[PDB]
Amino acid sequence: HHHMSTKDLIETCCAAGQQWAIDNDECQSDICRIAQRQCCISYLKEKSCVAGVMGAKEGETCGASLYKQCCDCCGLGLRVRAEGQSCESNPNLGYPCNHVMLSCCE
Amino acid sequence: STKDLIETCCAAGQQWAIDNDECQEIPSDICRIAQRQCCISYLKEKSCVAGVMGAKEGETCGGVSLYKQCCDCCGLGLRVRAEGQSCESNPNLGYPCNHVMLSCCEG
Amino acid sequence: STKDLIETCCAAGQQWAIDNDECQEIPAQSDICRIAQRQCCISYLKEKSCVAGVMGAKEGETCGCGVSLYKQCCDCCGLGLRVRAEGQSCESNPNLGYPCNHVMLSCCEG
Amino acid sequence: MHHHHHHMSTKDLIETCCAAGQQWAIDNDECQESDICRIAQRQCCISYLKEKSCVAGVMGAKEGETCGAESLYKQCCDCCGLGLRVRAEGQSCESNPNLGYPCNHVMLSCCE
Amino acid sequence: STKDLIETCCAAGQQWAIDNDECQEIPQSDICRIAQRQCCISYLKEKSCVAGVMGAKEGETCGGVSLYKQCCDCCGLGLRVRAEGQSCESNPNLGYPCNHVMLSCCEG
Amino acid sequence: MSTKDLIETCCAAGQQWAIDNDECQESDICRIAQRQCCISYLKEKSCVAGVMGAKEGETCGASLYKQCCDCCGLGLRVRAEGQSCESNPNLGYPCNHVMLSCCE
Amino acid sequence: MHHHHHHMSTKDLIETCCAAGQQWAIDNDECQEQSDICRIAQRQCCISYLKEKSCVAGVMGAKEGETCGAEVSLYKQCCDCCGLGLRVRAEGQSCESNPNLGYPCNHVMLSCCEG
Amino acid sequence: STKDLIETCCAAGQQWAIDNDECQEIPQSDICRIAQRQCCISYLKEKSCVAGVMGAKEGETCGCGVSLYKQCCDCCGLGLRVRAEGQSCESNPNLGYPCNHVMLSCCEG
């Protein structure tokens, strides 16, 4: 077994997952596995998203993915800003698209 | 305007999500991006809400579906609440997992 | 239980309201659940739009198949404001309905 | 141009136009019918029709009528039906303010 | 005299407006043709404007030389302000006759 | 925003749109005020150009350019004949005003 | 969201949920039936009731000559353990507590041996 | 004698439990088989129970085998929570054995 509350186990397994994501670029007792996987995936998602945003700002192609999603959503904001128009929050775009579009627009 | 075009193409995307339950064969870059993103967001939020309800109903938790993710994350919050403990925000869990865990933990 | 199902489906409805600004296309499901979902979705949007409406009126905005009470609560608040502005006290008028009466009184008193 | 001016207080105007609205609702079943007056008229007109349709809805549910598919008739029928189903299961009614007004009140009344 | 010719040709233009509801067709001197056309257009404009004002006051949806829509819209501005218990302010940027019509509808 | 302020705001936007772009394609209250102030600006500008055209001896054509050019031309022709100007309100606005101004 | 809160002590909640569990066991023979405290107490009291009942049936089974079974319910266990005590008694030997048999086997063996 | 056979087969069962952590394939008279199985199960039950209790005291939150790990952890947890509230422990035999005993033990100090 383990000798740890459910809250502490979540914290512990979350940190392990993040650490696994940093160590390896992939996310390969149920409570622990869920927290591990979720924190692993979130780290890789946020990283790919930030790379995507930087890609758009640098003029790089988004492709044809959180890289692509964040690149495209940043591109929306850039194009609006380029037209001299003000940015408006559109929650229908979802997360993180809306936030990314606004950030790139402002 | 670009703002109105986004709104228009966003509504088309939502409508496509309702009609087909997928965003793969969806039909300017601005329009295509807004369509796809609003299509995906709709399916994500729908599957997430279903997932939360699943967890509260005692279902086993186990494309764009957040059914499993939201079910799992809700389940974290429920288990902590069931132990009489308070939950703490953990942004490392990501979105919407953190928010869903907290919501399920605090009622 | 039915009570827990109502709570569960109610929270789903509220969550749907927060996520999308509508309850018309709220997505193998029981009537009890569908009713609670829709009703909690609508209540959330009504209360939110109402509070926004009240703030609108107090900030000097002139209001004059959805569920928004923006306009209603703005107008009803405006009634109370105008009475207050004339130095008069308000009187409860339940015929105005809910939440118009309550909102008018609240805006009339302070 | 000459016009007829009146100097009725806002409070009195609200009362007056409210009574007119209610009376219009009673006379005709629609609310097609100064901003102060128009708001009070419409709101009192609509409240009357809403309360009436709501009470009809409650009676509908208690009689076993269908509420409709996918309106205050329908809303109050559905909300009453929640309370009825809970009562039918032998369970006690719990206030749920999240259901809003008048749904919560109607659910409780039909439950108890 | 030129003054009398203007009056004469002006009355002809008004008459043409009444008869035919347009000013494209001419029923001779530049002075006369100009006065005819201008008085024809003015008559149709003022008529359509007054109809537009009445439309707005009667609750009609608003909307060539016709000012029906313009005067209906501009009246509607004044009505809405009046309905809110506020006084109107002259705004010359609205142009003529929009400003005048808005004010008239706002005052009563 | 109050209705009065919204009218002012949307009016100024319309004028600004007219100045920026030479056309008026661009709440109902806001859209009406925008369009009306846009159109008035373009109308007054074309009218003033028309008046200047007439005074410079330019042809009016065979439009507020043409209207104001023609109306100015009435006043010019009366003045040229040595006759005094008389207000004729039946000519309407701005024709009457323009004719008088060009006549005096 | 509005929620209904209650503030019952842990001790009272245990008592309450324990009584519910026992009642459920009496009403229905399963223990399938929101806080962990309540769920634990309910389940434990439900299962204990069914265990003690099946055990007593098992003891009576052994005394009546019934087969215990082969290879929640303590029917078999208590029947077998009673049978141990009966066989010792049948040999004219005195009963000796053997705690290694565990609970309730030891107690049941002794009772059947002496009784 | 029957008594000695019980003791013998009981010790075999215990020994099997110590060697392997199971009694499902416990490898002959009925008396012997019963004693073997029962002593095997009791040993694993008591062991898992004591581990469970220690788990709860060390801050673990536990809420078709023979393990009492979870049961004894949960029951200990009841006693701990009551003690943590400053309240006195009350015996509740309806909780059964060993839940009641374990709850009390964890409650008292």
Author numbering:
A (entry chain D): 423 to 450, 459 to 494, 503 to 544
B (entry chain C): 427 to 453, 459 to 493, 501 to 545
C (entry chain F): 427 to 453, 457 to 493, 500 to 545
D (entry chain E): 419 to 451, 459 to 495, 503 to 544
E (entry chain G): 427 to 453, 458 to 493, 501 to 545
F (entry chain H): 426 to 451, 459 to 494, 503 to 544
G (entry chain A): 419 to 451, 458 to 495, 502 to 545
H (entry chain B): 427 to 453, 458 to 493, 500 to 545
Structure paper excerpt:
We were able to obtain diffracting crystals and solved the structure in the P21 space group at 2.2 Å resolution. The structure included four dimers (AB, CD, EF and GH) in the asymmetric unit, with each dimer in a local two-fold symmetry. The overall structure of each chain is predominantly α-helical, which is consistent with the CD data. There are four alpha helices (T428-D445 for α1, D460-E488 for α2, L504-A520 for α3, Y533-E544 for α4) which all run in the same direction. The loop structures between α1 and α2 (N446-S459) and between α2 and α3 (G499-S503) were incompletely modelled in all 8 chains indicating the flexible nature of these regions. The structure has a disulfide bond architecture which stabilizes the three anaphylatoxin modules. In total, 8 intra-molecular disulfide bonds are found in the domain. All of this suggests that in fibulin-2, the three anaphylatoxin modules are all embedded into a single-domain four-helix structure forming a dimer with covalent bonding via C500. Cys500 locates in the flexible α2-α3 loop, which is only partly visible in the electron density maps. When combined with the non-reducing SDS-PAGE and MS, which both indicate that all of the protein is in a disulfide linked homodimer, the crystal structure data implies that the inter-subunit disulfide is formed, but that it is not stabilizing the flexible nature of the α2-α3 loop.
Fibulin-2 is a multidomain, disulfide-rich, homodimeric protein which belongs to a broader extracellular matrix family. It plays an important role in the development of elastic fiber structures. Malfunction of fibulin due to mutation or poor expression can result in a variety of diseases including synpolydactyly, limb abnormalities, eye disorders leading to blindness, cardiovascular diseases and cancer. The three anaphylatoxin-like modules (C435-C543) following the N-domain are also found in fibulin-1, but not in other fibulins.
